[PDB]
Design a protein around this ligand. Structure first.
Ligand SMILES: Nc1ncnc2c1ncn2[C@@H]1O[C@H](COP(=O)(O)OP(=O)(O)O)[C@@H](O)[C@H]1O
Ligand SMILES: Nc1ncnc2c1ncn2[C@@H]1O[C@H](COP(=O)(O)OP(=O)(O)O)[C@@H](O)[C@H]1O
Ligand SMILES: [Mg+2]
Ligand SMILES: [Mg+2]
Lengths: 316, 319
């Protein structure tokens, strides 16, 4: 199916160890099942089991998330389509770790954004396509758009007369990427602007949607195609506002194929409408904690993910 | 005033540094002020404010010394640690043992000072301690060595005292030396862990009540013979992110005692009922509200300061 919903459980954090939290999550990648103990350790009946397209346990490496989730989407983007990958879940559960990763050929801790830019340059260089890569990074905080790549303030959004499904975010910085490695410089500039916004506007990353958009202009010739590909890598606000519920309803409507998809009822869904309403690949990575301490927010994340795409539990 | 409300801010933790969290709390010990940047600072005034650099010994001297003095005079006192999981309730109430330990909290320091003071002035004394856990309004004995994990304690009215309760079968361990407290705390932690695993009685969702009772007889020729009973309740509350009904009931009990309103609703939670004899009776009570300085915990920090402010409303001084 075009809409893929997957769950990634992170390892325990130090806060969870110090709080004497217990492990309440069991990840079965084979059966694509997540089970959460809501009762005693001898109360096996009081488990809630959820089924998804894929389940990544705490030991899952960055490269393995990339290969399973991103590779099929990037293939579609290179064919000249507009696709979106979301990271959804509680602050601290690994949305940013999944979407960007860390540093401290590819860094093993590299997330989807750096790996995607690496693979674009590798694949398009390898098959001799004529291509250019530009990237934008904007933040949505309190329903206002902030440009994280403008080296100089809210962005204005209006309808694209060329496309009913499109918007124009006027003056949005689109940085040309010249090499595979330049993504890290761009991410550093973004993080510096993100920090400035947190200090002065209280625009905390955990309370903001981050939309990283890569656009690829391609011309492919064979002796015997003009393509535009777009990938939106969306690091959502912590799931612990109305925009997340609107996104939920937009995804459910696309899975169940109902006539009315409420793109217009949030800035998030309006901005991504062109990359959602095209029979395109979309993936949601729901990130969760394994710890008893975060039971309520883990269950809320799994309920959200289940409501987005209802997959039935199979018999054991 | 007999009800003291203080705020203790912990240092940043690794998670907060790695997340590039911003400091959103300013602690002014001199002005007894905590200010939180809400983006527009919200300023709160308390009896004392301890910043991130505050040592364990300095919390003990400011908060506990005046209370223990009153307990030794034969009164019943309570100290609460209130706030978000990870902000240092247990660190404040028990502390830790490094690899008097500088990291020792209120419980070990209190037992040390009881033995030192009463030995020093030649008082005839005995010390007993109980440790119970309240989870989902049910009482678990953490010092009973034989009891089944699923065994709950029963509470009855004390016919000798309308304000008192009898917690039937509650283990009360005689403390023979200053150092024995650590062994007792270890036995408690082991029972706590067993209860978490089998009964889902998670420590971060439970109230811990450590009660020390001191029987004292002080004799002076040409002076008085004093027969005294002192009680100190050291209460490590459930994480405040849990707001249960019991934390709101405690809130209402403290507000009623500060504002001196006619009905104090002790009976509306097991926590406030158990501590009723040690509350309101013109005895010293202290609440230590623990907070994080980091942006990541803004919502729960504001909730803690609002709770603490609602318990004892002190007006901000002119700027
Ligand atoms: N799957 C994972 N494996 C290892 N560490 C992880 C994982 N997910 C998150 N982390 C770590 O957990 C912390 C919080 O992750 P972060 O991406 O900031 O969460 P979020 O963006 O959802 O608030 C960071 O230290 C990060 O490195
Ligand atoms: N004031 C403080 N100074 C130093 N470390 C602290 C302080 N408060 C808390 N900590 C540390 O923070 C962690 C969490 O504290 P803890 O006592 O478990 O919090 P709580 O009991 O409120 O959940 C522990 O590792 C503890 O040592
Ligand atoms: Mg993040
Ligand atoms: Mg604790």
């Amino acid at each position: 199916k075009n809409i893929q919903v997957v769950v990634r459980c992170r390892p325990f954090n130090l806060a969870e160890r110090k709080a004497s939290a217990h492990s309440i999550v069991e990840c079965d990648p084979v059966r694509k099942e997540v089970s959460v103990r809501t009762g005693g350790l001898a109360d096996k009946s009081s488990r809630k089991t959820y089924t998804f397209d894929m389940v990544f346990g705490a030991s899952t490496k960055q490269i393995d998330v990339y290969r399973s989730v991103v590779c099929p989407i990037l293939d579609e983007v290179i064919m000249g389509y507009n696709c979106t990958i979301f990271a959804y879940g509680q602050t601290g559960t690994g949305k940013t770790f999944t979407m960007e990763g860390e540093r401290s050929e590819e860094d093993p801790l590299a997330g989807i954004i750096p790996r995607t830019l690496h693979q674009i340059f590798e694949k398009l260089t390898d098959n001799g396509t004529e291509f250019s890569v530009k990237v934008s990074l904007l933040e949505i905080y309190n329903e206002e758009l902030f440009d994280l790549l403008n080296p100089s303030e809210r962005l204005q959004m209006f309808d694209d007369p060329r496309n009913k499904r499109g918007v124009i975010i006027k003056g949005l910085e689109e940085i040309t990427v010249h090499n595979k490695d330049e993504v890290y410089q761009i991410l550093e500039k973004g993080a510096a602007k993100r920090t400035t916004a947190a200090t002065l506007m209280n625009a905390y990353s955990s309370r903001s949607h981050s939309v990283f958009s890569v656009t690829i202009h391609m011309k492919e010739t064979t002796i015997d195609l003009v393509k535009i590909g777009k990938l939106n890598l969306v690091d959502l606000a912590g799931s612990e506002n109305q925009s997340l519920l609107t996104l939920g309803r937009v995804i459910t409507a696309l899975v169940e194929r109902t006539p009315h998809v409420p793109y217009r009822e949030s800035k998030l869904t309006r901005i991504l409408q062109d990359s959602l309403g095209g029979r395109t690949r979309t993936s949601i990575i729901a990130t969760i904690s394994p710890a008893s301490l975060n039971l309520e927010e883990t269950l809320s994340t799994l309920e959200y993910a289940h409501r987005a795409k209802n997959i039935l539990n199979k018999p054991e």
